[PDB]
């Protein structure tokens, strides 16, 4: 029995490729898909974070929809303490990125009357009056509901749908009153305090970057975060408002645009051009559009990002039941697998790691599934199509990278070793989706952390001083990657790896060697 | 914003096909993927079953792991009452099949000290002793657990892992004592009564068809069920035993083999050729094999069933969260869409329809998702592959079927209408996975009910008596299909459809306008 | 072994398709590529023409660059006598088409002085060219007359001039007041009334000369089936020919001959205006560098296949058979690769008009074309042809359904009932392996069907029936008998039958066993 689905890899049709997928064909040790973990009460402590990292966390996500700067500053410090606790052995050190997820133009309800911790029951068919009068902002109940978007009545009409609390409650407007927004409860259910509101289709006029988002983004610059997940990006100019707030100081912070409503889907191309990457934010997306269409937008966005060479993240509810249970549902297992099969660079955990009872188990499961799914990719067709859908180029670095990927398929390489200052050389390889892991050796700490955005890049940070004679410094960076691979089980002595290097001291990568492991 | 993802249909690469998927491209009205609903307390009533059918239920599954013959007989009559409640309008009548899912070689624990509602906590690292002694069968607690598999000790050894309650609790064998199988709790969890036990990697020597299974199968023959879902099929031998029990009286009942353990995957090809169809039984399968590997087995089995032209069902936890909530998670929506993309003929609901609070909404969600995913199939590549990975016939019906599918892709027709007595002609069309719905006109009611196992077949049961003129009896059945398709919104007057009939072998194809 | 290269037919790659081509896999009896023969002194006797027909000739080409109307009228008369000599058995009768190949804008030298002897032109020698008619019968090695009075306006010092199928080349050395002056580059025996090419000159001769008008109107009176229009440079040339043919000749097919650089460059607009194309490699290889002709041939055949219009590969396919009874290996290669390229027809000129082995050359083209037809990689060809979209047109959908079915059941033929030919043409455009037996009652339809690959046209002279169903079966049975007599299939084989249903067009396909 061959390993890593290599028998299905040789199938001449996609149908026969499926027929050959073999549960007794073990995957390789390396896992190429990045795992982004939302950090929260269940995962904040240094000790848990050390375990989170050992279980495979690549990026810590902080959701500024909730929490104070004090809280998030402590979280980040704990993330950094846990991460740096492994620095004592640079062979086994893994950089861990920090990601700031903005609140964005959220609409929220007020507090339920009383203590504010209660819920009230909305009954199917009942009337619910929405009010903007702040006298009710802490007096919400089943008859009068307050919410924080003051211009709501200007963007809805009789017949407009309104969803509350993750889309669990639906209302249809039946009167725009003088002091009222009168609705009927279409889907009833329990209503707590400060729940999310979606106005599907409505031209919501909240700013893309609010005064609160400006504070969080500046805070993110001060805290040296590696990326921003910008909530509710509707258009290319929304990305500009994030970018100008990040300013010159934040010029190297990646802006991942979160697509979560119909306008963002419709304007995806202009958004993708303006962004450093994309998040398929399926939570709001499946409220904003019919939930049965989310997989279309997911596959469209992943496909276009692979085509553009830009990082794409699949997010929200992929292991949801593991908030309460130690094992995932069969739908959750196949959802993680299919996100990798679609071509997602990273997958994400929100409540599973932020507040659930089984954060470590959830991280470990994404690790296990992604590694199985990575072997089950039909590389033959994928690589054929990525080359064909790619231009011809005067760029030798492009030609070197595609040559390296092609060679790595031919000799079933244990890795592709790339020396890179900015990441670009490693990113160029990853865009061709080799099956071998891409060990990117860099001395730039930010490059190393940001590399998790790209499928297959295993970033190793070299802290050794620069060697005189650049020939000797190229070696002992290759050798550093050789020792990481052996220590991690990616390959052993006598295996073949591919090594990408330049011709002199950034963008001079032009040399591929097919090199045995010493 | 075009229709039914036809822009994505035109793409020259799968990557560009993905890039072209369009949330503003609306699917056709017809939904090709069959929906199987497990019936239970939440869905047993004639009132609910009528709504189940209205929401899109095609097959009623009865799980004989639980319940009595008297109980199941009442469920079955309710299904037929609700189904026939629509039989007065043959233009809108939908056949509903009945499926019997056997118990099979299940292992169960006993009752917690007291009731079936009591639970105890099992703590990580604690000792738990398993007993086969019936003195303990109603005195299970945190130290002693009874299960009903009398021979378990001759099948495990020290170091073996034992899973309880959907694999949520795991134990490791530490000693094989004289009266007690003593284990250490590995995964802690609350343990109730009568929970399923799994023994991955053990040669479980329970009979494939037990004495309970025989009387359930004979009952199914008496009750005129359309198909059997046979649990824990491990080898072709097991299928033959089910077919033997069904006997001559049940020779037309379809046997779907449920693949839920390692041996059934390893022996899949021989199980498939012995079987009429396959169920990817993901619940147990995910406990028997590492859960991260299930999608491999799912795609392997769907691919091989597509290759063989046999029905395949994807089952278990597709919309699990809708047992308690009125909308699925995003993983659940994705799971359903991807099963259809994978090529499954049918998708299934178990707890969502049997006992949860939103059985109707779960059926409607599978209906909505399946239909969106059917349009998102990359038919260009799929039709090319099914043709190449298919033998050369000499069979005139096979050639007519593939030509009809080819023609239907060319003239983007509203349906393929086929007159079939046995179903075979429609099955041969469905095996090539046309985009267009297949309206199979039959007078055989069992053919009508069993047609749901095949993707795309909309069975319509002609109740008219036969006309003397065969040429006129053909037109009467064809025009009945035209009225069905117009009443249901599949196409309208002037649209183009494909019509498959015989010469008094289904061997003639007509491209005709809807009148 | 397998037959008709079916083992190579199911290869997954073109490379493996080549690897499986098998000299021991014999082809089917039917030959799909049309054979066009230039009728001339070696081939216009009634008795020879009978043997041409029996050897495989489908179209008689008459080259109006030479001969008088009276001479050509007799040739047409003899062709029709030979052809109708087989009408006494309607089952073995093959329609034979008559094609009129125009003179077009030719340039010709005058007569060698007497008495058509030849003079030797020597490399390096001087040769004066005159336009003075005083010299038109006194050409020799020193002075040569030609009939293009405006030649001095379109050439210059340095211009190259080619005489006698490009075998003799001259370079212009001065333009005198009278007598252009020239040096011989390639020497050779110069005979009388030889053809002249001026590659890259704006030769302003009319597309349709007064002589062409007479010849075209002669063609109408003689009821010819098609016109091969020489030296078509642009769409408006095609329009000129069509206008001269006018209303009386409106059913005559116009095949444009692509013979120079301008015709290649403007190919698309010429193809659009034309009924089909001839790759006139003789002139074309003088007008453009000979090493580029295969580029223009493959381009033109590819675009004609893409457009569904007939294309003829012509000139020097079996040249050495003018004098020897066997072709060279390049000639065998040339014919095969023309068929593999996709040519609807292949042509003979001197091999049949004036050579010593006209029958052997016809038979060689028949033998090669049939081997090459089996070697076509139909899997790729059909996939790619299909990939061009699904039009509402139900005749198109039926045609592609029939071709797909014919691949599936390896049918002995596709039988098509057609008045105008169109349904049969639509089938041929998808290039089935099986022969297409087009049953028509129109004799011109039957003769023009030869322009489309694979159409074996049969002329039904049985009377119409009042019962449409009976009239269909009569014509289908006639095609069955034709196929049985010709060895295409036999009792028990399977054929595909394309018909209309109650005439109102071709929307019915049946997969039918041969009785
Ligand atoms: O904000 C998110 O992550 C979402 O909606 O999925
Ligand atoms: O038996 C079943 O249905 C399962 O385990 O999924
Ligand atoms: O006219 C022709 O036959 C040629 O030039 O090949
Ligand atoms: Mg969101
Ligand atoms: Mg089970
Ligand atoms: Mg010529």
mmCIF file of N, CA and C in Angstrom, chain B residues 427-475:
data_model
loop_
_atom_site.group_PDB
_atom_site.id
_atom_site.type_symbol
_atom_site.label_atom_id
_atom_site.label_comp_id
_atom_site.label_asym_id
_atom_site.label_seq_id
_atom_site.Cartn_x
_atom_site.Cartn_y
_atom_site.Cartn_z
ATOM 1 N N UNK B 427 -32.686 4.306 -14.746
ATOM 2 C CA UNK B 427 -31.443 4.127 -14.000
ATOM 3 C C UNK B 427 -30.237 4.341 -14.897
ATOM 4 N N UNK B 428 -30.312 3.826 -16.132
ATOM 5 C CA UNK B 428 -29.222 3.965 -17.087
ATOM 6 C C UNK B 428 -29.020 5.417 -17.493
ATOM 7 N N UNK B 429 -30.096 6.206 -17.543
ATOM 8 C CA UNK B 429 -29.943 7.640 -17.791
ATOM 9 C C UNK B 429 -29.303 8.317 -16.587
ATOM 10 N N UNK B 430 -29.762 7.975 -15.380
ATOM 11 C CA UNK B 430 -29.280 8.657 -14.183
ATOM 12 C C UNK B 430 -27.787 8.430 -13.970
ATOM 13 N N UNK B 431 -27.288 7.254 -14.362
ATOM 14 C CA UNK B 431 -25.889 6.891 -14.172
ATOM 15 C C UNK B 431 -24.943 7.817 -14.930
ATOM 16 N N UNK B 432 -25.444 8.573 -15.905
ATOM 17 C CA UNK B 432 -24.629 9.532 -16.629
ATOM 18 C C UNK B 432 -24.816 10.936 -16.107
ATOM 19 N N UNK B 433 -25.583 11.086 -15.033
ATOM 20 C CA UNK B 433 -25.683 12.328 -14.275
ATOM 21 C C UNK B 433 -26.024 13.547 -15.132
ATOM 22 N N UNK B 434 -27.121 13.503 -15.887
ATOM 23 C CA UNK B 434 -27.552 14.705 -16.596
ATOM 24 C C UNK B 434 -27.923 15.796 -15.602
ATOM 25 N N UNK B 435 -27.828 17.033 -16.086
ATOM 26 C CA UNK B 435 -28.327 18.189 -15.359
ATOM 27 C C UNK B 435 -29.843 18.154 -15.271
ATOM 28 N N UNK B 436 -30.494 17.753 -16.361
ATOM 29 C CA UNK B 436 -31.945 17.811 -16.433
ATOM 30 C C UNK B 436 -32.575 16.758 -15.524
ATOM 31 N N UNK B 437 -33.719 17.073 -14.917
ATOM 32 C CA UNK B 437 -34.440 16.055 -14.152
ATOM 33 C C UNK B 437 -34.905 14.936 -15.067
ATOM 34 N N UNK B 438 -34.951 13.729 -14.512
ATOM 35 C CA UNK B 438 -35.402 12.539 -15.225
ATOM 36 C C UNK B 438 -36.801 12.219 -14.713
ATOM 37 N N UNK B 439 -37.813 12.352 -15.574
ATOM 38 C CA UNK B 439 -39.187 12.005 -15.208
ATOM 39 C C UNK B 439 -39.446 10.594 -15.704
ATOM 40 N N UNK B 440 -39.547 9.657 -14.783
ATOM 41 C CA UNK B 440 -39.716 8.250 -15.123
ATOM 42 C C UNK B 440 -41.192 7.901 -14.942
ATOM 43 N N UNK B 441 -41.873 7.650 -16.039
ATOM 44 C CA UNK B 441 -43.282 7.290 -15.997
ATOM 45 C C UNK B 441 -43.384 5.773 -15.899
ATOM 46 N N UNK B 442 -44.045 5.293 -14.853
ATOM 47 C CA UNK B 442 -44.196 3.868 -14.646
ATOM 48 C C UNK B 442 -45.601 3.592 -14.124
ATOM 49 N N UNK B 443 -46.048 2.351 -14.316
ATOM 50 C CA UNK B 443 -47.251 1.841 -13.676
ATOM 51 C C UNK B 443 -46.939 0.927 -12.500
ATOM 52 N N UNK B 444 -45.695 0.503 -12.363
ATOM 53 C CA UNK B 444 -45.285 -0.367 -11.279
ATOM 54 C C UNK B 444 -45.034 0.527 -10.071
ATOM 55 N N UNK B 445 -45.825 0.386 -9.003
ATOM 56 C CA UNK B 445 -45.639 1.258 -7.833
ATOM 57 C C UNK B 445 -44.326 1.024 -7.106
ATOM 58 N N UNK B 446 -43.800 -0.193 -7.114
ATOM 59 C CA UNK B 446 -42.524 -0.428 -6.458
ATOM 60 C C UNK B 446 -41.391 0.230 -7.237
ATOM 61 N N UNK B 447 -41.448 0.149 -8.569
ATOM 62 C CA UNK B 447 -40.488 0.862 -9.402
ATOM 63 C C UNK B 447 -40.493 2.351 -9.088
ATOM 64 N N UNK B 448 -41.690 2.930 -8.954
ATOM 65 C CA UNK B 448 -41.827 4.337 -8.609
ATOM 66 C C UNK B 448 -41.161 4.647 -7.274
ATOM 67 N N UNK B 449 -41.344 3.782 -6.277
ATOM 68 C CA UNK B 449 -40.791 4.083 -4.967
ATOM 69 C C UNK B 449 -39.278 3.886 -4.931
ATOM 70 N N UNK B 450 -38.776 2.831 -5.574
ATOM 71 C CA UNK B 450 -37.349 2.538 -5.539
ATOM 72 C C UNK B 450 -36.528 3.469 -6.421
ATOM 73 N N UNK B 451 -37.171 4.257 -7.287
ATOM 74 C CA UNK B 451 -36.457 5.157 -8.189
ATOM 75 C C UNK B 451 -35.729 6.271 -7.447
ATOM 76 N N UNK B 452 -36.113 6.531 -6.196
ATOM 77 C CA UNK B 452 -35.495 7.578 -5.405
ATOM 78 C C UNK B 452 -34.040 7.278 -5.091
ATOM 79 N N UNK B 453 -33.623 6.021 -5.195
ATOM 80 C CA UNK B 453 -32.237 5.683 -4.923
ATOM 81 C C UNK B 453 -31.287 6.240 -5.978
ATOM 82 N N UNK B 454 -31.806 6.708 -7.109
ATOM 83 C CA UNK B 454 -30.988 7.156 -8.222
ATOM 84 C C UNK B 454 -31.148 8.651 -8.391
ATOM 85 N N UNK B 455 -30.020 9.355 -8.346
ATOM 86 C CA UNK B 455 -29.987 10.795 -8.526
ATOM 87 C C UNK B 455 -30.747 11.216 -9.779
ATOM 88 N N UNK B 456 -31.646 12.191 -9.615
ATOM 89 C CA UNK B 456 -32.287 12.829 -10.738
ATOM 90 C C UNK B 456 -33.594 12.214 -11.189
ATOM 91 N N UNK B 457 -33.959 11.036 -10.694
ATOM 92 C CA UNK B 457 -35.197 10.411 -11.144
ATOM 93 C C UNK B 457 -36.363 10.990 -10.353
ATOM 94 N N UNK B 458 -37.267 11.678 -11.052
ATOM 95 C CA UNK B 458 -38.550 12.066 -10.491
ATOM 96 C C UNK B 458 -39.605 11.026 -10.915
ATOM 97 N N UNK B 459 -39.945 10.050 -10.070
ATOM 98 C CA UNK B 459 -40.890 8.994 -10.484
ATOM 99 C C UNK B 459 -42.331 9.486 -10.430
ATOM 100 N N UNK B 460 -43.090 9.211 -11.487
ATOM 101 C CA UNK B 460 -44.511 9.537 -11.509
ATOM 102 C C UNK B 460 -45.288 8.266 -11.823
ATOM 103 N N UNK B 461 -46.280 7.958 -10.993
ATOM 104 C CA UNK B 461 -46.967 6.672 -11.054
ATOM 105 C C UNK B 461 -48.248 6.837 -11.857
ATOM 106 N N UNK B 462 -48.264 6.264 -13.055
ATOM 107 C CA UNK B 462 -49.436 6.334 -13.914
ATOM 108 C C UNK B 462 -50.488 5.348 -13.414
ATOM 109 N N UNK B 463 -51.648 5.878 -13.024
ATOM 110 C CA UNK B 463 -52.739 5.056 -12.521
ATOM 111 C C UNK B 463 -53.765 4.689 -13.589
ATOM 112 N N UNK B 464 -53.762 5.385 -14.731
ATOM 113 C CA UNK B 464 -54.614 5.083 -15.876
ATOM 114 C C UNK B 464 -54.546 3.604 -16.234
ATOM 115 N N UNK B 465 -55.650 3.012 -16.685
ATOM 116 C CA UNK B 465 -55.570 1.681 -17.296
ATOM 117 C C UNK B 465 -54.938 1.777 -18.672
ATOM 118 N N UNK B 466 -54.477 0.636 -19.158
ATOM 119 C CA UNK B 466 -53.731 0.592 -20.409
ATOM 120 C C UNK B 466 -54.687 0.700 -21.593
ATOM 121 N N UNK B 467 -54.330 1.536 -22.567
ATOM 122 C CA UNK B 467 -55.102 1.667 -23.797
ATOM 123 C C UNK B 467 -54.714 0.574 -24.784
ATOM 124 N N UNK B 468 -55.675 0.171 -25.619
ATOM 125 C CA UNK B 468 -55.402 -0.889 -26.584
ATOM 126 C C UNK B 468 -54.306 -0.468 -27.555
ATOM 127 N N UNK B 469 -54.403 0.746 -28.090
ATOM 128 C CA UNK B 469 -53.391 1.234 -29.018
ATOM 129 C C UNK B 469 -52.110 1.515 -28.243
ATOM 130 N N UNK B 470 -51.054 0.745 -28.525
ATOM 131 C CA UNK B 470 -49.777 0.970 -27.855
ATOM 132 C C UNK B 470 -49.224 2.348 -28.190
ATOM 133 N N UNK B 471 -49.362 2.778 -29.443
ATOM 134 C CA UNK B 471 -48.912 4.118 -29.789
ATOM 135 C C UNK B 471 -49.684 5.181 -29.021
ATOM 136 N N UNK B 472 -50.953 4.922 -28.693
ATOM 137 C CA UNK B 472 -51.716 5.899 -27.925
ATOM 138 C C UNK B 472 -51.433 5.790 -26.432
ATOM 139 N N UNK B 473 -51.168 4.582 -25.935
ATOM 140 C CA UNK B 473 -50.802 4.432 -24.534
ATOM 141 C C UNK B 473 -49.438 5.049 -24.242
ATOM 142 N N UNK B 474 -48.532 5.049 -25.225
ATOM 143 C CA UNK B 474 -47.263 5.762 -25.081
ATOM 144 C C UNK B 474 -47.514 7.257 -24.938
ATOM 145 N N UNK B 475 -48.307 7.823 -25.849
ATOM 146 C CA UNK B 475 -48.558 9.261 -25.818
ATOM 147 C C UNK B 475 -49.277 9.666 -24.544
#
